[PDB]
Design a protein around this ligand. Structure first.
Ligand SMILES: *[C@@H]1O[C@H](CO)[C@@H](O[C@@H]2O[C@H](CO)[C@@H](O)[C@H](O)[C@H]2NC(C)=O)[C@H](O)[C@H]1NC(C)=O
Ligand SMILES: *[C@@H]1O[C@H](CO)[C@@H](O[C@@H]2O[C@H](CO)[C@@H](O)[C@H](O)[C@H]2NC(C)=O)[C@H](O)[C@H]1NC(C)=O
Ligand code: N7O
Length: 223
């Protein structure tokens, strides 16, 4: 997160921190969010050979008694996930066991009107600048949902599938490692951090959750 502030600890109890062993071996981290006791929603490009989720965290380098660390038993990448167009960057993770709902660990509701111009919030443990490490503490920033035309420089941007997030006239932005985290507008999950410019200039591109709700329901109903 760039230009944000440290979250009040545990004030965003749906937040998941993902440790990912990629197929090759090198580790990666992403954000995500709890939507059922045993399901986390995140970005598909965060898939790997194995994933562990940490719920209830604030400083991710220091365990607290609020922590629930759960192994992922199955990854469900969207079937149309496309590395050429970067479309359909969304994935459900089934946890090996159900998390316990507590004050520090809870689920995030879905919606079902947010047009360009609305102010949203995104939280994550991603890098806090181009030459900065990931943040040890959960950070959050308020970002403007932009008209899709503000992302017209991104090849293949599709307003039906994606959101354009972050005023280009300011430096505030989601950034590397915030991928998979939710964009919250009016207390509902509206987007998932997907990608952006390496040089951190907003806007960034998010997956539009509303478009995928029937797929999410399909996966949940079959589990
Ligand atoms: C996040 O937690 C880590 C680990 O406890 C903190 O880093 C430690 O900080 C203490 C001083 O407070 C040092 O003596 C240790 O050497 C640090 N450990 C490591 C692994 O670096 C860190 O300060 C915490 N971050 C915040 C913002 O509170
Ligand atoms: C990723 O998206 C690309 C572009 O839409 C897909 O390639 C197109 O696939 C259709 C299949 O009917 C063809 O008609 C086009 O000619 C293809 N375009 C190009 C540039 O090859 C591609 O198949 C998708 N990949 C996945 C994994 O679904
Ligand atoms: C390192 P990261 O956080 O995981 C992120 C990334 O590489 N996204 C890739 C997406 C994607 C989507 C579909 C695909 F099929 C696919 F192969 C990849 C990233 C790189 S620069 C940047 C700047 C702002 C933000 Cl928010 C994230 C990013």
């Amino acid at each position: 997160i760039i230009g944000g502030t440290e979250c009040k600890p545990h004030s965003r109890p749906y937040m998941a921190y993902l440790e990912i062993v990629t197929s090759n071996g090198p580790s990666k981290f992403c954000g995500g969010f709890l939507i059922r006791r045993n399901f986390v929603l995140t970005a598909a490009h965060c898939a790997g050979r194995s994933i562990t989720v940490t719920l209830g965290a604030h400083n991710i380098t220091e365990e607290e008694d609020t922590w629930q660390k759960l192994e992922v038993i199955k990854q469900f990448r969207h079937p149309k996930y496309n590395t050429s167009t970067l479309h359909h960057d969304i994935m459900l993770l089934k946890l090996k066991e159900k998390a316990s709902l507590t004050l520090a660990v809870g689920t995030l509701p879905f919606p079902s009107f947010v047009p360009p111009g609305r102010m949203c919030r995104v939280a994550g443990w991603g890098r806090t600048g181009v030459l900065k490490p990931g943040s040890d503490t959960l950070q959050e920033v308020k970002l403007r949902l932009m008209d899709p035309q503000a992302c017209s420089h991104f090849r293949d941007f599709d307003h039906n599938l994606q959101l354009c997030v972050g005023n280009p006239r300011k430096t505030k932005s989601a950034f590397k490692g915030d991928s998979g985290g939710p964009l919250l507008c009016a207390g509902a999950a509206q987007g998932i951090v997907s990608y952006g410019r390496s040089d951190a200039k907003p806007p960034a591109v998010f997956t539009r959750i509303s478009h995928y709700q029937p797929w999410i329901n399909q996966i949940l109903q079959a589990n």
